[PDB]
Structure 1
Amino acid sequence: PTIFEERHLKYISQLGKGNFGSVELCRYDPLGDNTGALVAVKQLQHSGPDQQRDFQREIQILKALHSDFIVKYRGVSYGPGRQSLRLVMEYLPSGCLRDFLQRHRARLDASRLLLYSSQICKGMEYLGSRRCVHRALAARNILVESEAHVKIADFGLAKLLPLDKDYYVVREPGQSPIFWYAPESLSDNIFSRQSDVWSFGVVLYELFTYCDKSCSPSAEFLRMMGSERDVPALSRLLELLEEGQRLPAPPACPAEVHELMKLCWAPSPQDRPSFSALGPQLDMLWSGSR
């Protein structure tokens, strides 16, 4: 059931694109009559050995995960020729949380944002128990399964920690979403479950601003960077963070949630709460808001 025949996968449209891959909406149509189930299918482009190797990793991680808060693996496909590997996932037609928040802001209250926050945290706790660092976590890669249920997706940068080490180091990335990453990741290329906690803090900021473009992390950076304009953003960001500057509390954000953000953004990775510690707090806040 987990091998999809490539000649039965029918392309419909593009769901996502990165440097080295794309996720495409397809129909799996073994009967050839356009009645089959729809699926989301990842494949690589511009890929070298490192990219192919990372994709094999991504498939093994996603296949092993079984959480209500992680996008479901369905299977794999291989065509003829080479570079033929495809990853088949469930398709969630409500799309990403970033877009959903922007579209429906006026009817999504703080209780609903608290629900999403709790669900994302549960998915991250699941990941943590499997020693998996997600790295990419952001509203643009969390999917909406229904209006009261979200799931973590985009495992393109996910990695398992070795059994005896609590972090990994990479060679410097070419293109990082700098406003989501922990300072030790930006400066020293160190990633861990604690860098993921930093990014989750930025996710909370995204949720409680409804991903409004006027107060996006980049927009806030550009306001806070000061009157000197032509300074490289990464260099300046790292200075601001080292000075202790942080994203502001969204006006509508509950004070307790802002305090959690600040804890997620502790300078030392060891001072940040674990997802296991954040979950009960968000759960308490969500259940208090019903």
Structure 2
Amino acid sequence: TIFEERHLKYISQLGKGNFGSVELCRYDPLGDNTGALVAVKQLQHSGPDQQRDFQREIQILKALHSDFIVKYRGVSYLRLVMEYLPSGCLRDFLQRHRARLDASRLLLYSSQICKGMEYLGSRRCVHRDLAARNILVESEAHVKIADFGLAKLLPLDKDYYVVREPGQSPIFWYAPESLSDNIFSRQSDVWSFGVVLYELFTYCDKSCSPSAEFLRMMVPALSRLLELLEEGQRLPAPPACPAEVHELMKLCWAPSPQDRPSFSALGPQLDMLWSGS
């Protein structure tokens, strides 16, 4: 649980985002290159607000225990040590392996992500950055939610959270209430899950990505996106998308957070489709 810094050997950068970076390191206390590989998050550079956020992220991740959430391994004193999943993120894995991954498998990943989100919700955790680029692949048939850099715990007496600064993530995964009023909730994570189902079923192809679709659907982009959403415009069904999968996405994109299903209602539905595919 406590890793000594001198034993963590730097290999490469894995990714970066919201003021943090994740490195691939070997935890190599013998110094002979035989130790296990780990992913180590740290701030990219120092700053006291980032620091306080980072401490909370660590406390959140340490207290999450799910097969569908990336595993906390410990800390180094300033760094968060996590399991390293060499297949990397689901966005990349989908683009590389599309020819091999059928509808059944995408429904399997969808069910696993839903089940991880159901668990997060039970912990009063709003993830706030759900997207295929932040889901990791453990094996061919197992994914895990990662990137808790923006995650918040809801107080016991309130089911939403208002953020003060504007968001910094690609705008096409945010719910309308987040776009307009910086409100985030478990039901805003359901909106984002609908976009994740869209990514899965397009295999993260860049030409039909959420972003590419907006510049086709056509004043600042954020205001334009909100007007398009208020008018009831949505991303079109992915090529060859099963009808029932598309209906589920549209339900996740109900205008009113209270009309979106919960992850507990979504889960059984995905399983039934997975069993019926």
Q: TM-score, normalised by structure 1?
A: 0.94
Q: Which residue pairs with 1:263 in the alignment?
A: 251
Q: Deviations over 1:84-124 (max 9, x none)?
A: x0000000000110001001111110000000000000000
State the 1:288 CA deviation.
Answer: 1.3
State the 1:174 CA deviation.
Answer: 5.3
State the 1:253 CA deviation.
Answer: 1.1
Aligned-residue RMSD, C-alpha: 0.9
Match of 1:152 among 145, 152, 164: 145
Separation of aligned partners in 2, 1:278 and 1:137: 16
State the 1:49 CA deviation.
Answer: 1.8
Q: Does the 8 Å CA contact 2:18/2:149 hold for their aligned counterparts?
A: no
Separation of aligned partners in 1, 2:167 and 2:178: 13
Matches within 5 A, 1:1-290: 2-78=1-77, 85-173=78-166, 175-225=168-218, 231-289=219-277
Separation of aligned partners in 2, 1:21 and 1:274: 30
Q: Deviations over 1:234-265 (max 9, x none)?
A: 11001100100000001211111111100100
State the 1:19 CA deviation.
Answer: 4.2
Give runs of ≥4 in structure 1 deviating > 4 Å.
none
State the 1:277 CA deviation.
Answer: 0.5
State the 1:45 CA deviation.
Answer: 2.2
Q: Does the 8 Å CA contact 1:69/1:150 hold for their aligned counterparts?
A: yes
Q: Does the 8 Å CA contact 2:129/2:169 hold for their aligned counterparts?
A: no
Q: Does the 8 Å CA contact 1:96/1:143 hold for their aligned counterparts?
A: yes
Separation of aligned partners in 2, 1:194 and 1:107: 32
Separation of aligned partners in 2, 1:143 and 1:175: 21
Separation of aligned partners in 1, 2:254 and 2:44: 37
Separation of aligned partners in 2, 1:251 and 1:22: 35
Q: Does the 8 Å CA contact 1:94/1:145 hold for their aligned counterparts?
A: yes
Q: In terms of mean alpha carbon deviation, does 162-171 or 42-51 score higher?
A: 42-51
Distance 1:185 1:100, change over 3 A: same
Q: Does the 8 Å CA contact 2:206/2:212 hold for their aligned counterparts?
A: yes
Q: Does the 8 Å CA contact 2:188/2:257 hold for their aligned counterparts?
A: yes
Structure 2: any 5+ residue segments left out of the alignment?
Answer: none
Q: In terms of mean alpha carbon deviation, does 171-180 or 264-273 score higher?
A: 171-180
Q: Does the 8 Å CA contact 1:20/1:47 hold for their aligned counterparts?
A: no
Identity over aligned residues, as a percent? Answer: 100
State the 1:186 CA deviation.
Answer: 1.0
